[PDB]
Design a protein around this motif. Structure first.
Motif, mmCIF file in Angstrom:
data_model
loop_
_atom_site.group_PDB
_atom_site.id
_atom_site.type_symbol
_atom_site.label_atom_id
_atom_site.label_comp_id
_atom_site.label_asym_id
_atom_site.label_seq_id
_atom_site.Cartn_x
_atom_site.Cartn_y
_atom_site.Cartn_z
ATOM 1 N N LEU A 54 0.814 -1.174 0.000
ATOM 2 C CA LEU A 54 0.000 0.000 0.000
ATOM 3 C C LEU A 54 0.885 1.277 0.000
ATOM 4 C CD1 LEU A 54 -2.701 1.289 0.581
ATOM 5 C CD2 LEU A 54 -2.441 0.875 2.956
ATOM 6 N N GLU A 55 1.909 1.301 0.826
ATOM 7 C CA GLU A 55 2.796 2.463 0.932
ATOM 8 C C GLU A 55 4.195 2.018 1.257
ATOM 9 O OE1 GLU A 55 1.307 6.211 1.820
ATOM 10 O OE2 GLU A 55 2.889 6.550 3.395
ATOM 11 N N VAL A 56 5.183 2.733 0.678
ATOM 12 C CA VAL A 56 6.593 2.509 0.995
ATOM 13 C C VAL A 56 7.147 3.894 1.338
ATOM 14 C CG1 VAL A 56 8.808 1.620 0.262
ATOM 15 C CG2 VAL A 56 6.672 0.667 -0.679
ATOM 16 N N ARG A 57 7.766 4.010 2.510
ATOM 17 C CA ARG A 57 8.266 5.303 2.963
ATOM 18 C C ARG A 57 9.711 5.145 3.467
ATOM 19 N NH1 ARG A 57 5.550 10.517 6.181
ATOM 20 N NH2 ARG A 57 7.515 11.680 5.984
ATOM 21 N N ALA A 58 10.593 6.025 3.023
ATOM 22 C CA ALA A 58 11.973 6.059 3.492
ATOM 23 C C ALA A 58 12.080 7.216 4.464
ATOM 24 C CB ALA A 58 12.961 6.223 2.341
ATOM 25 N N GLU A 59 12.281 6.895 5.738
ATOM 26 C CA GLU A 59 12.378 7.897 6.795
ATOM 27 C C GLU A 59 13.161 7.342 7.965
ATOM 28 O OE1 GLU A 59 8.712 8.849 8.803
ATOM 29 O OE2 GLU A 59 7.746 6.958 8.312
ATOM 30 N N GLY A 60 13.902 8.235 8.606
ATOM 31 C CA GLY A 60 14.710 7.912 9.769
ATOM 32 C C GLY A 60 15.663 6.766 9.557
ATOM 33 N N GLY A 61 16.348 6.746 8.411
ATOM 34 C CA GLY A 61 17.305 5.711 8.093
ATOM 35 C C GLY A 61 16.772 4.333 7.741
ATOM 36 N N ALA A 62 15.457 4.201 7.566
ATOM 37 C CA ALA A 62 14.835 2.908 7.303
ATOM 38 C C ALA A 62 13.802 3.053 6.202
ATOM 39 C CB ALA A 62 14.159 2.397 8.563
ATOM 40 N N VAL A 63 13.412 1.928 5.630
ATOM 41 C CA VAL A 63 12.287 1.878 4.746
ATOM 42 C C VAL A 63 11.147 1.092 5.435
ATOM 43 C CG1 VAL A 63 11.373 1.026 2.593
ATOM 44 C CG2 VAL A 63 13.593 2.087 2.657
ATOM 45 N N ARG A 64 9.985 1.714 5.482
ATOM 46 C CA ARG A 64 8.785 1.126 6.044
ATOM 47 C C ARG A 64 7.835 0.775 4.926
ATOM 48 N NH1 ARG A 64 10.345 2.370 11.132
ATOM 49 N NH2 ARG A 64 11.393 4.417 11.136
ATOM 50 N N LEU B 177 18.112 0.750 4.710
ATOM 51 C CA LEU B 177 17.773 0.628 3.318
ATOM 52 C C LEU B 177 17.159 1.961 2.802
ATOM 53 C CD1 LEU B 177 16.265 -2.877 2.836
ATOM 54 C CD2 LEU B 177 18.701 -2.212 2.960
ATOM 55 N N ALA B 178 17.134 2.073 1.483
ATOM 56 C CA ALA B 178 16.519 3.206 0.758
ATOM 57 C C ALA B 178 15.700 2.608 -0.375
ATOM 58 C CB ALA B 178 17.585 4.138 0.203
ATOM 59 N N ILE B 179 14.866 3.443 -0.984
ATOM 60 C CA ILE B 179 14.103 3.054 -2.134
ATOM 61 C C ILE B 179 14.937 3.317 -3.380
ATOM 62 C CG2 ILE B 179 11.980 3.433 -3.460
ATOM 63 C CD1 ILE B 179 10.782 4.590 -0.774
ATOM 64 N N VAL C 121 11.524 2.335 -8.749
ATOM 65 C CA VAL C 121 10.072 2.125 -8.815
ATOM 66 C C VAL C 121 9.797 1.919 -10.255
ATOM 67 C CG1 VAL C 121 7.799 3.074 -8.352
ATOM 68 C CG2 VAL C 121 9.741 3.677 -6.919
ATOM 69 N N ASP C 122 9.224 0.745 -10.582
ATOM 70 C CA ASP C 122 8.962 0.387 -12.005
ATOM 71 C C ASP C 122 7.473 0.200 -12.113
ATOM 72 O OD1 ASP C 122 8.496 -0.903 -14.554
ATOM 73 O OD2 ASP C 122 10.501 -1.854 -14.380
ATOM 74 N N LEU C 123 6.865 1.104 -12.868
ATOM 75 C CA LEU C 123 5.410 1.186 -12.922
ATOM 76 C C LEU C 123 4.843 0.155 -13.873
ATOM 77 C CD1 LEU C 123 4.281 3.187 -10.935
ATOM 78 C CD2 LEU C 123 6.430 4.022 -11.882
ATOM 79 N N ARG C 124 5.640 -0.335 -14.809
ATOM 80 C CA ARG C 124 5.173 -1.383 -15.724
ATOM 81 C C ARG C 124 4.938 -2.621 -14.875
ATOM 82 N NH1 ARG C 124 4.271 0.052 -20.566
ATOM 83 N NH2 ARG C 124 5.816 0.901 -22.030
ATOM 84 N N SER C 125 5.988 -3.021 -14.166
ATOM 85 C CA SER C 125 6.000 -4.292 -13.449
ATOM 86 C C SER C 125 5.368 -4.230 -12.102
ATOM 87 C CB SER C 125 7.432 -4.785 -13.328
ATOM 88 O OG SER C 125 8.183 -3.965 -12.475
ATOM 89 N N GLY C 126 5.187 -3.038 -11.542
ATOM 90 C CA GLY C 126 4.713 -2.886 -10.207
ATOM 91 C C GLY C 126 5.764 -3.222 -9.148
ATOM 92 N N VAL C 127 7.049 -3.203 -9.497
ATOM 93 C CA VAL C 127 8.072 -3.526 -8.542
ATOM 94 C C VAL C 127 8.780 -2.325 -7.961
ATOM 95 C CG1 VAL C 127 10.261 -4.767 -8.228
ATOM 96 C CG2 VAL C 127 8.382 -5.758 -9.655
ATOM 97 N N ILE C 128 8.881 -2.300 -6.641
ATOM 98 C CA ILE C 128 9.647 -1.308 -5.908
ATOM 99 C C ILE C 128 10.863 -2.040 -5.334
ATOM 100 C CG2 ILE C 128 9.616 0.279 -3.946
ATOM 101 C CD1 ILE C 128 6.472 0.258 -4.455
ATOM 102 N N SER C 129 12.071 -1.659 -5.759
ATOM 103 C CA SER C 129 13.330 -2.307 -5.315
ATOM 104 C C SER C 129 13.991 -1.508 -4.242
ATOM 105 C CB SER C 129 14.297 -2.438 -6.481
ATOM 106 O OG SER C 129 13.646 -3.154 -7.499
ATOM 107 N N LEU C 130 14.344 -2.133 -3.133
ATOM 108 C CA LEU C 130 15.099 -1.494 -2.073
ATOM 109 C C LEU C 130 16.595 -1.722 -2.240
ATOM 110 C CD1 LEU C 130 12.827 -2.255 0.961
ATOM 111 C CD2 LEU C 130 12.552 -0.510 -0.858
ATOM 112 N N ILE C 131 17.395 -0.784 -1.767
ATOM 113 C CA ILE C 131 18.839 -0.863 -1.836
ATOM 114 C C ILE C 131 19.411 -0.424 -0.504
ATOM 115 C CG2 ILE C 131 19.014 -0.508 -4.322
ATOM 116 C CD1 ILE C 131 19.744 2.479 -3.756
ATOM 117 N N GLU C 132 20.693 -0.662 -0.289
ATOM 118 C CA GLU C 132 21.412 -0.038 0.832
ATOM 119 C C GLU C 132 21.381 1.475 0.716
ATOM 120 O OE1 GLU C 132 25.370 -1.606 0.031
ATOM 121 O OE2 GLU C 132 25.672 -2.173 2.144
ATOM 122 N N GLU C 133 21.153 2.143 1.826
ATOM 123 C CA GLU C 133 21.102 3.610 1.869
ATOM 124 C C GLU C 133 22.455 4.232 1.437
ATOM 125 O OE1 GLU C 133 20.013 4.949 5.806
ATOM 126 O OE2 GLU C 133 19.374 6.901 5.097
#
Lengths: 62, 62
Positions: free
Chosen positions: A21-31, A45-47, A50-62
């Protein structure tokens, strides 16, 4: 829009979370909040992508 | 699904980009690709939030 979050751990383990539903990067973390009224928090982690075709949100090291 | 990118400048000015295909954070910038084969680079920004209800991807100062 329907989305999943993906991340790969340092050991090569891959985690995917659906029904996002929601992905938020705040306070050094991804929620990541999902449709089952659950939140998953990933410190350091960081965001990365975001790939809108596939619907995939990939996280990475901050 | 439709998504847009939104960011707010230090002065309160807002920018919105519609018809977003991909958003990627790399090398201290966010790159936004749109459906019309246009790419916009925002140095110094990160991806702050992805909201699946609204289709909004919010950028923030890194």
């Amino acid at each position: 829009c329907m989305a999943k979050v993906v991340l790969t751990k340092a050991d090569g383990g891959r985690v995917e979370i659906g029904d996002v539903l929601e992905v938020r990067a705040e306070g050094g973390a991804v929620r990541v909040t999902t449709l089952f009224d659950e939140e998953h928090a990933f410190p350091g982690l960081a965001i990365g992508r975001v790939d809108l075709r596939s619907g995939v949100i990939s996280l990475i090291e901050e």
